[PDB]
Chains A and B, each alone.
Chain A
């Protein structure tokens, strides 16, 4: 029959993506693909055999058009008139990592397995991270030519 991963089959690696001057959607899609494990031939939608992804320089990320001051991030508290909106500009200047986190999280499945996969994403607004002990592998967003 088709191969199925067992208890100790999944092996995880660490990647770091430098978000400097990278389109938000492009980086978010690449990071979602890495987190889901779609790049591994042993992929199984049942299992979270993905990899740990580190994103540094989250505040340097590139947003095209006028989406910096015309795209809103919304949230409702649950109380009447509890709708709050911030543009990408102030959201970046206050919580730089939140833009990248929101974008990536919106691109992976909304099941419980997606909640588990979220745990393997670390984003940092600075150029450095505290995960040097894991020796992350630098990652470049390339496109396979056809």
Chain B
């Protein structure tokens, strides 16, 4: 039985070419170049899914730092005071409060300042 290769190959070629819509130049037209770019794209996506959590945490920390310095307190002392006070709001919702409900953020800053020690540089 002589077997022609067309159907089996066309299947995966169509899959790869469809996945490469929107690419520039050869990378969206030719199957080989599109396949190379697909390897790179999936590697990039895998790496970026891991890095995205850190990126968003960095953005939240930036916003919380801005809103805390607006209340005359630094981010690190505010985090220490919030941990001491036992409140368990994470940085995502802390930034959400900072942007959407400034009064709530000010109240949390007040409780964090209350929970802080009297001399932060003491050998405690």
Contact = CB atoms under 8 A, between A and B. Distances in A.
Interface of A: 2-3, 38-45, 144, 146
A40 B56 contact: no
Given A45-B59, A144-B73, A146-B120, A3 B96 contact: yes
Given A2-B60, A3-B96, A45-B59, A146 B76 contact: yes
B74 A41 contact: no
* Chain B, interface SS category: helix
Contacts, number: 41
Q: Identify whether the interface residues of A are mostly helix, strand, loop, or mixed.
A: loop
Contact of A41 (B66, B72, B76): B66
B27 interface: no
Indicate the size class of the contact surface on chain B.
20 to 34
A39 B59 contact: no
A43 to B, nearest CB: 6
Contacts of A38: 62, 66
Contacts of A41: 63-64, 66-67, 70, 95, 98-99, 102
